[PDB]
C-alpha cells in the first residue's frame, strides 16, 4: 500500500519502541519491544511531520491520531495542535547514525532505560548528554513501523 510508508517506530538501543500504553489522552508514553507488545497494534507506529516551526517535528500516532507532547519529566500523547510548542521536537543526528530526540519546549532529551527487570522501559526527559548507559540512554533509531511489509522488488 501507500499509507504504510508514512509510519515508523522510534526504537531504543534495546529494541524497545516508544509507544502509547494507556489509550486515553494525556497518559504517559512507555517503551515496549514488539515481541512483548504484539497485541498493542498500531498505537506503536508514528508519523513524523514538520512542526509549526521549520526544523522541528511532531509525532502523530498511527492508530489514535494523537501527538507526542513533552510534559513534566516524561512524554504524554494529546490532541494535536500546531500551536502547542511542547509538541515539537528536534531530531539531533549523532556520529553513529542514531538520533537524540530533543524537546523544543523543554530543551531536554527523551531518555530511557535500555535495561529493565520488566518487559518495558520508562521514558523520561533530562539533560541532553547523549548518554548510552544500561539504565540511562538517549539514543533511538528511526526504524520501520511494526506492520506487515510488502516486497516492492
Amino acid at each position: 500500500p501507500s499509507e504504510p510508508s508514512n509510519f515508523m517506530t522510534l526504537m531504543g538501543q534495546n529494541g524497545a519502541l516508544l509507544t502509547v500504553w494507556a489509550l486515553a489522552k494525556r497518559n504517559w508514553l512507555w517503551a515496549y519491544p514488539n515481541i512483548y507488545s504484539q497485541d498493542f497494534g498500531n498505537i506503536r507506529n508514528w508519523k513524523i511531520e514538520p512542526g509549526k516551526h521549520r526544523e522541528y517535528f511532531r509525532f502523530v500516532n498511527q492508530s489514535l491520531g494523537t501527538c507526542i507532547e513533552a510534559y513534566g519529566n516524561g512524554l504524554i500523547h494529546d490532541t494535536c495542535s500546531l500551536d502547542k510548542l511542547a509538541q515539537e521536537f528536534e531530531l539531533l543526528p549523532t556520529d553513529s547514525g542514531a538520533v537524540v530526540i530533543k524537546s523544543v519546549s523543554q530543551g531536554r532529551c527523551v531518555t530511557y532505560n535500555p535495561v529493565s527487570p520488566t518487559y518495558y522501559s520508562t521514558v523520561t526527559l533530562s539533560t541532553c548528554d547523549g548518554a548510552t548507559e544500561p539504565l540511562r540512554d538517549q539514543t533511538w533509531y528511526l526504524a520501520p513501523p511494526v506492520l506487515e511489509a510488502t516486497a516492492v522488488n
Binding site: S5, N6, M8, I48, E49, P50, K52, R54, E55, F57, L82, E90, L91, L92, P93, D95, G97, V99, Y141, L142, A143, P144, P145, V152, N153
Partner: protein, 261 residues
C-alpha cells in the same frame, strides 16, 4: 514555482564497494511517503540502480554527459516511477557522478560550467519543469571555492543575460554539497550585489555531515520576488530524517527544502 516542489539533496558517497545498496536503502526512502521528494539531487551517485533503464531521449547537446533514465520503485504490475537525469562525470572511477531524480519528466536539461568545470571541477547539472529550474552541484572539497563562479554563471545564464526572454521568468534552485558553511558562501556572494540581491541561501542549522559541519543546502532565485526581497521566500530547509527507516549509509545527512506550512 519552486515552493510547489519538495526538493531534497543527498551526497550518497558512492564507490565501487558500496553503491547499489545505498540507492535501495536510503534513496528509496527519501522518495517515498507523503513527504517524499518531488526532486532529489544526488552527489557522488556512482552507478544508477541496476534496474534503471535509459530512455531513447537525447538531451545531451554539449560535451558533458547527461542522460535520462526511468526507475521503477514498485513492482512491474504496480509501478511507481521516477526519472533520473544522470551525468557520469567520473570516467576514471565512476563514483563522483551527479544525478537528479524526478517524479516528473524534465522539459529540458542543462549543464552550466564555472571557471574550472573544464579543468578539474564539476559543473552544475540541472533540469527544467515548466518555469522552475533545479540544479545539483558538488563544489570542490577544499572549501568549495568554485561555488561562487557556479552560482554566478547560472544567474547570468537565466536571469541577467538570458538568450531568450522566457528565461528571465524562470525560477531556479541550486542544491547540493557546497563544501563550505552557508555564512561563508553568503559572505563571498555579497561581493557581487547583482547575484547576492537576486538570491537567497536556504540551509539547515543542524549539521549535515558527520564532522558536524553544515555543507549541504540550497541557494535560489525566485523570479516572482523582487531584487533584495528573496528572503521573503516561504521555503525552509532541514534535515530529512523524518524519511528514514534505516541507517544513513553515507556521512552526509539528507536535506529537504519545502514550503512553510
Amino acid at each position: 514555482n519552486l515552493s510547489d516542489f519538495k526538493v531534497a539533496t543527498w551526497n550518497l558517497q558512492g564507490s565501487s564497494a558500496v553503491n547499489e545498496s545505498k540507492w535501495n536503502i536510503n534513496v528509496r526512502q527519501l522518495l517515498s511517503g507523503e513527504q517524499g521528494a518531488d526532486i532529489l539531487m544526488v552527489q557522488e551517485a556512482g552507478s544508477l540502480p541496476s534496474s534503471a533503464v535509459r530512455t531513447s531521449r537525447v538531451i545531451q547537446h554539449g560535451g558533458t554527459p547527461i542522460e535520462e533514465y526511468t526507475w521503477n520503485l514498485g513492482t512491474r504490475s504496480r509501478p511507481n516511477m521516477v526519472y533520473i537525469y544522470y551525468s557520469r562525470l567520473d570516467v576514471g572511477a565512476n563514483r563522483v557522478n551527479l544525478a537528479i531524480v524526478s517524479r516528473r519528466q524534465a522539459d529540458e536539461a542543462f549543464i552550466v560550467h564555472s571557471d574550472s568545470s573544464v579543468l578539474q571541477s564539476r559543473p552544475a547539472v540541472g533540469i527544467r519543469i515548466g518555469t522552475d529550474v533545479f540544479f545539483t552541484v558538488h563544489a570542490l572539497a577544499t572549501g568549495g571555492s568554485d561555488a561562487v563562479s557556479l552560482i554566478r554563471n547560472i544567474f547570468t545564464t537565466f536571469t541577467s543575460s538570458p538568450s531568450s526572454p522566457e528565461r528571465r521568468g524562470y525560477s531556479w534552485m541550486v542544491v547540493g554539497d557546497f563544501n563550505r558553511a552557508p555564512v561563508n558562501l553568503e559572505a563571498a556572494l555579497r561581493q557581487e550585489p547583482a547575484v547576492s540581491e537576486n538570491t537567497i541561501i536556504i540551509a539547515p542549522t543542524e549539521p549535515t555531515h558527520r564532522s558536524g559541519n553544515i555543507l549541504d543546502y540550497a541557494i535560489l532565485h525566485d523570479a516572482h520576488l523582487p531584487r533584495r526581497e528573496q528572503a521573503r521566500e516561504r521555503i525552509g530547509a532541514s534535515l530529512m530524517l523524518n524519511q528514514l527507516r534505516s541507517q544513513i549509509t553515507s556521512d552526509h545527512f539528507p536535506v529537504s527544502f519545502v514550503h512553510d506550512r
